[PDB]
């Protein structure tokens, strides 16, 4: 598998902005910053490792196709079910381990990249959730 089109669209905009002179080549002196923008939690060790591996020449210019490949090397494994579970439990007000169906619908519709009702109703029905039931997000991530 490879990265989706949404991820291409996000990594573009971000890297096209951070090109402080709009030439098509970002400076390595600031690479660490833009990586945080794309949802990475970096340490200085890995940053210096990427500096050396790409800029052994000493130019210090990073281009779009290289940036996508280096990000793919990072995005090999960083997140798991635990990262998803924490992202679910920020809705879990009381530490019970269950979430409401109507609230999940709302946030999936209202925020980010708006879903359709048909897709979110599929998300509920195929998860084997009762309409008047609470959604075990731990069990849901285990099922997905």
């Amino acid at each position: 598998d490879q990265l989706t089109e949404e991820q291409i669209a996000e990594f573009k905009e971000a890297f096209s902005l951070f090109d402080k002179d709009g030439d098509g080549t970002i400076t390595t002196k600031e690479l660490g910053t833009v990586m945080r923008s794309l949802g990475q939690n970096p340490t200085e060790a890995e940053l210096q490792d990427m500096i050396n591996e790409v800029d052994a020449d000493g130019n210090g210019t990073i281009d779009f196709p290289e940036f996508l490949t280096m990000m793919a090397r990072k995005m090999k494994d960083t997140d798991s079910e635990e990262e998803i579970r924490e992202a679910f439990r920020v809705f879990d007000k009381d530490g019970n381990g269950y979430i409401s169906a109507a609230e999940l619908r709302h946030v999936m519709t209202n925020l980010g990249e708006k879903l359709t009702d048909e897709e979110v109703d599929e998300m509920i029905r195929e998860a084997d959730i009762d309409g008047d039931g609470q959604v075990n997000y731990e069990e849901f991530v285990q099922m997905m």
């Binding site: 989706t4 949404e6 669209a9 996000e10 573009k12 905009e13 971000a14 096209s16 902005l17 402080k20 002179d21 709009g22 030439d23 098509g24 080549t25 945080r36 923008s37 794309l38 949802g39 210019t61 281009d63 779009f64 196709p65 290289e66 990262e83 998803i84 992202a87 679910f88 920020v90 809705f91 946030v107 999936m108 925020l111 980010g112 990249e113 879903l115 599929e122 998300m123 997905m144």
Partner: protein, 752 residues
């Protein structure tokens, strides 16, 4: 295989070097010109507003004005407070703003609770309150004229005479920028237009003027590897093409087409009337360049391969081309000299079909216009300007005598004095009959002009837009006391470089519209199918709006999907589709005055019907000569109104996004120098600096807010027991959206 452009975007001091003399001569009288400091004069107006605020609160008559004016006053004062870093001024303004809160909280609880909702959202809480027609009331200027019982300064009086439209024009740099990028999103019910006693006043130009008169003067530099510095050695060509008339396809202009075994075309170009060898060696070097670096820029066009460039005897060319039908026109186009220079290249067939050929179906055109729009703008960024796509001329009565040289300016409101509406095009049907856009990509590259030359006083810039570099003179502007010319215009001299960057982009998209406009009419002429008629027109309206969306995506780097939404707010596609359908067809020429008025009203829903006093010509329409159709009446605006509206929404988006993101970088470099341990203050100042950083994010974008979120968490960790009352709610929302995205991204798995 590194895809990197050889241009470099930077910043200089001022362009004002080797300009025309800043003097106008009228009947022998030498009148000089002087500048009003825009920044200074506005700042003076801001300060005068503040003393007027003080005067009113001293008056104790807050009952005198409606509640909505008061609410606006409150939200603006709190925003001006946060935008200023002067501590003494900050304390002054908050002391000024407090009694307003004392009144509004007490008297009107409904509106007050609405404001308090808005105060927690964003610490620029004016931009979120003026995202509708509440703007069209000028609260600041009205209040000034109310309470400024002093003789006005002249400079200020001249300023407010140009920008009487809105109150938004008096915000300092960061706040205004954020508003003018935030008035495009799904929330905004904004429309740059208002009615006043049956007099419609548009100002969808004035917004662009007022943004650009703030930005730092842009300056390009080409790197050493670029063509227009690389002193490449002469073209070594020993290859000759023995020509046979037996293989001639056709003749066009000064070009001959000959068949190949590979289904391709080998073409011969002969030199023009007065065009020397200079253009022909230039075109050759261009084509060799743009095939050497086709992998770099990833220019999508099938581009022509050159082969040879030398001289030939005229007799052979005259002997060979004699067979064809159009020999008289070809004979007159070549020069009288017996030694004629040639230029040969090889191309796919689709190179010699003009984009506006009616033998193409819709999908082929869709993906052909897409290809051509992308290749124009990708090239532009590199540093190559195409001035000579189409010879769109305004008139031919003043051609030489007048300033603009009859050359159509797409932004004629920006580059002149007291010129508002976009101008009548003349004989347009023919004016793009030899347009450079071809169904296989870009063509005729020999007329190229380095982008650097758009910023200097080159032959071109000095030739065409003289009255930009000169300085604005107008009868009324003349002050007898000073004997010199004062304006808010003259100051455009230092900053003309930007106005010629956006004029490039705006003229490009106008070539695209006229071409798609000509195609449509040419194919729909022979149609009886009124549903199919709209089916063709609707398709070419959509292709136009996809075209502007590919423009913005390459220039500024917004994803196209979002960019289309950020456009389709402004120029309501349905109006634009209809305007075109009507104003380009010879159909309306067969109407009476009453049927015309009924068709006019139905097509210009909200705006007034178009007024004109020309006598129509059967089969043609409006004509100055009497054979070729125009666009618009005699000495009036374009009938393609919503085309102007789309053009200004394209530019104000490109400039107003690059400028905003220059603002965001200033604030981030600020906040980090706070966090690291160089600039040392308390929690409140730190929280404020992070709150401002969130408010200068791109419209409806996600990742930018995600970055600031990370900073806020680092900031809150740094200050352990710091109060978090003000800034939990905003980041909470941002936190929730980051969560929602992650969930939605993982879901993308319902496959296999």
């Amino acid at each position: 295989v590194k895809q990197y452009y050889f241009a470099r975007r930077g910043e200089t001091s001022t362009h004002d070097t080797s300009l025309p003399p800043p003097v106008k001569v009228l009947s022998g009288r030498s009148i000089p010109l002087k500048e009003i400091p825009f920044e200074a004069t506005r700042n003076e107006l801001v300060q005068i507003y503040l003393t007027s605020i003080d005067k009113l609160i001293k008056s104790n008559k807050l009952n005198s004005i409606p509640s909505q004016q008061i609410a606006s006053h409150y939200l603006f004062l709190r925003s001006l407070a946060n935008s200023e870093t002067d501590g003494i001024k900050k304390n002054q303004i908050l002391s000024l703003a407090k009694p307003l809160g004392t009144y509004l909280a007490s008297k009107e609880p409904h509106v007050w609770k609405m404001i308090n909702e808005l105060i927690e959202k964003s610490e620029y809480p004016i931009i979120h309150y003026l995202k509708n027609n509440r703007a069209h009331s000028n609260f600041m200027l009205a209040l000034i004229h109310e309470y400024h019982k002093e003789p006005l300064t002249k400079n200020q009086s001249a300023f407010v005479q140009k920008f009487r439209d809105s109150s938004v024009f008096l915000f300092p740099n960061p706040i205004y920028t954020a508003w003018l990028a935030h008035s495009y999103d799904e929330d905004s019910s904004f429309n740059p237009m208002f009615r006043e006693r049956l007099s419609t006043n548009f100002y969808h130009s004035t917004l662009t003027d007022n943004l650009l008169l703030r930005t730092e003067p842009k300056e390009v530099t080409l790197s050493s590897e670029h063509h227009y510095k690389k002193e490449k050695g002469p073209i070594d060509s020993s290859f000759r093409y023995q020509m046979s008339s037996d293989r001639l396809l056709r003749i066009q202009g000064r070009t001959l087409l000959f068949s190949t075994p590979q289904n391709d075309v080998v073409a011969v170009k002969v030199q023009k009337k007065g065009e020397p060898k200079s253009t022909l060696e230039e075109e050759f070097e261009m084509a060799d360049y743009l095939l050497k670096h086709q992998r770099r820029l990833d220019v999508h066009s099938k581009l022509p391969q050159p082969l040879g460039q030398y001289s030939v005897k005229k007799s052979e060319i005259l002997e060979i081309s004699r067979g064809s039908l159009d020999f008289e026109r070809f004979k007159t186009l070549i020069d009288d000299s017996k030694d004629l220079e040639v230029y040969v290249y090889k191309a796919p067939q689709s190179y010699f079909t003009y984009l506006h050929d009616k033998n193409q179906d819709l999908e082929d055109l869709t993906a052909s216009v897409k290809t051509n729009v992308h290749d124009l703008f990708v090239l532009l960024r590199e540093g190559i300007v195409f001035p000579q796509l189409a010879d769109i001329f305004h008139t031919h009565f003043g051609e030489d005598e007048r300033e603009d040289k009859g050359r159509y300016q797409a932004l004629v409101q920006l580059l002149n004095v007291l010129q508002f509406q976009l101008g009548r095009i003349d004989k347009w049907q023919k004016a793009v009959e030899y347009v450079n856009l071809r169904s296989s990509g870009l063509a005729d590259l020999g007329d190229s002009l380095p982008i650097t030359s758009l910023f200097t006083s080159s032959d071109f810039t000095k030739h065409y837009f003289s009255e930009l570099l000169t300085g604005g003179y107008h009868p009324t502007f003349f002050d007898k006391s000073s004997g010199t010319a004062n304006s808010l215009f003259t100051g455009k001299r230092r900053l003309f470089g930007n106005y010629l960057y956006l004029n490039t982009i705006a003229e490009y998209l106008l070539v695209i519209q006229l071409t798609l406009g000509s195609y449509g009419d040419k194919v729909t002429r022979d149609m009886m199918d009124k549903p199919k008629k709209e089916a063709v027109w609707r398709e070419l309206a959509n292709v136009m709006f996809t075209s502007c969306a590919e423009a913005i995506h390459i220039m500024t780097g917004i994803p196209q999907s979002r960019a289309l939404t950020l456009l389709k707010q402004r120029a309501n596609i349905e109006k634009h589709f209809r305007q075109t359908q009507f104003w380009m067809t010879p159909d309306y020429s067969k109407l009476d005055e009453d049927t015309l008025q009924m068709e006019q009203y139905s097509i210009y829903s909200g705006e007034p019907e178009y007024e004109f006093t020309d006598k129509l010509v059967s089969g043609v329409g409006l004509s100055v000569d009497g054979v070729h159709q125009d666009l618009g009446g005699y000495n009036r605006e374009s009938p393609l109104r919503e085309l102007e509206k789309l053009l200004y929404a394209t530019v104000t988006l490109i400039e107003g996004t690059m400028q905003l993101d220059k603002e965001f970088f200033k604030q981030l470099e600020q906040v980090e120098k706070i966090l690291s341990g160089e600039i040392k203050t308390d929690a409140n100042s730190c929280f404020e600096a992070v709150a401002q950083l969130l408010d200068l994010a791109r419209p409806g974008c996600h990742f930018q807010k995600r970055l600031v979120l990370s900073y806020y968490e680092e900031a809150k960790l740094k200050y352990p027991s710091a109060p978090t009352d003000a800034y939990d709610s905003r980041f909470q929302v941002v936190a929730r959206t980051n969560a929602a995205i992650t969930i939605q991204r993982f879901w993308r798995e319902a496959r296999k």
